[PDB]
């Protein structure tokens, strides 16, 4: 499947955005992996261990542009 177009975000590996972790805190983040079958992405919250990476659907409002 193809990712949606959303302003301020590019859905590609290594692209940067802001992402809401499961504690509802925003962090500058990086797209690590994209699952194009499910439409979800592995998001890495910067300066956190990769054990805290989270899978977020690419149309989620847990993702927003990084200014």
């Amino acid at each position: 499947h193809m990712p949606p177009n959303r302003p301020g975000i590019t859905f590609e590996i290594g692209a940067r955005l802001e992402a809401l972790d499961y504690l509802q805190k925003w962090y500058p983040s990086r797209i690590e992996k994209i699952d194009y079958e499910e439409g979800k992405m592995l998001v890495h919250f910067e300066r956190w261990s990769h054990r805290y990476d989270e899978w977020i659907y690419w149309d989620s409002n847990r993702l927003r542009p990084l200014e």
Partner: peptide, 6 residues
């Protein structure tokens, strides 16, 4: 830095 407490 961790994300849970107990």
């Amino acid at each position: 830095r961790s994300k849970s407490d107990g």
